[PDB]
Amino acid sequence: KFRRSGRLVDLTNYLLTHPHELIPLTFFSERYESAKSSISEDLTIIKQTFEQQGIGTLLTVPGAAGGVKYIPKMKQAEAEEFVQTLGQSLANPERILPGGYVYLTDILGKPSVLSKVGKLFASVFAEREIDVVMTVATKGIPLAYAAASYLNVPVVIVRKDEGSTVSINYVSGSSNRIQTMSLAKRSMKTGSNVLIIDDFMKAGGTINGMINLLDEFNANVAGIGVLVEAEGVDERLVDEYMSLLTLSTINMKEKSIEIQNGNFLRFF
Amino acid sequence: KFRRSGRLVDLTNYLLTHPHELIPLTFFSERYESAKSSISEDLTIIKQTFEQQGIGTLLTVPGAAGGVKYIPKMKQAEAEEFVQTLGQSLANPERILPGGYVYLTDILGKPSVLSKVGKLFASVFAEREIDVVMTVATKGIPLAYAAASYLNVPVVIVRKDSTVSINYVSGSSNRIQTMSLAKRSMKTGSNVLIIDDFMKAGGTINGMINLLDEFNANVAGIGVLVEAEGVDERLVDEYMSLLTLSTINMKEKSIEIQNGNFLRFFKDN
């Protein structure tokens, strides 16, 4: 039958494991063998706690098609504190790599770090219509998956090497050599709304390549998120995008590195 | 502060997002401004609900400096059901391609699937000592992360391109490849859960195991989503598989999928 206590625990779990899914009140009412109106009072308690604790919000549709949807959201204050902490650990001279690159590998491997970044991306882009999260192998993948797990959409990975395939030449900052990115035609429907995620935007050719690839699929750019941007990305290369951090100054020989907030506050 | 109701909700959230961490009772007492004995009653309700709903195990560690640890677990019944359903999705004729053969890419990218497989892997290897999850680029990276997030460990991604390199041969290829890992990317002595999406002939996983030897690392376990039939002498190291793939077109427009060996990992010797 479920006591009120067990009901709150189970509902909390159920909502948290089914983010961005509209769940009919009748599903819970049958699950708990309780009246829908009692479920709604339970949802009011979870909503309040979710909001007070910075977990997210519950959106409800009343009436005959009645249902509830859990939206992961991050409060501005948590976002700023988290990005600040991340930037401070990035501001380490030992992470400087040749070519104005920054060592992110340890950071991109940690579960706690990834889930906060994923959540921040899902929070900012929560209201966009997004069908799919896309990135290019290899380093962006963890970020793209983390974001996708909160938005509850597929992650699509563009390859650097099946079935029929769409291909796009592009240049990345790591070599003036022309590279090719490709995605199988079945990997994505025409007209998909696509969130592009990546770890580091240096000169913007990679994200621009992904934008050109979507153009071939007749898919739409719903949004763009990167963990770190270098200063001075050509605006023609990349449209609107959100960055968490800015690599504002780097110098291998001086072994000097400076990092600032990205533009993420514009999105709050 | 918190009414008790909000406390049950927040606590549930906190445990779920902090799997495989010992959380001292004092942490919760201070967080909710409530007595430890009141928190213990809440945790008893969560523990009982977590078990009945197949969410996992809430472990109590007794003592003045004790607390609780939430362990994600999946019941055998759900694992069996999940693997059957997944196997049936895999058998869809529309996944047959000329050449390579079976399109698995959407499955490897779907969060509902990834969350389930990750939890299954985490539940089976829950009691092993695991410092890190390891995989090779590219398609199975999300899977590695899903498993790692329930186990609460970092993921290390081996690259196909000081750095440690070893040669090996791939089942979906006909040439010697190289896999590599920076020494600064993984600690020596680590206990390692290797995760792989599709094991053909076993060269990749054996490459990984060889790599681990250069770091004096231990193979704590191996999980693969799908294995091809015909691992004769297989590979030196036991692994768990969910599904087995064979005859990729007989009669016409058909694919043969069977359950893997995962059930061995749910029973006692």
Ligand SMILES: O=P(O)(O)OC[C@H]1C[C@H](OP(=O)(O)OP(=O)(O)O)[C@@H](O)[C@H]1O
């Ligand atoms: O000048 P740009 O086009 O901005 O190039 C920046 C690179 C860096 C990043 O590394 P990954 O490709 O994620 O990782 P790896 O190259 O190691 O696979 C990739 O996504 C490109 O965006």
Ligand SMILES: O=P(O)(O)OC[C@H]1C[C@H](OP(=O)(O)OP(=O)(O)O)[C@@H](O)[C@H]1O
């Ligand atoms: O077991 P083997 O005999 O080595 O052959 C199977 C290979 C193929 C597969 O490559 P992926 O990394 O999944 O392919 P991609 O790089 O396209 O993701 C990987 O899982 C290896 O197990």
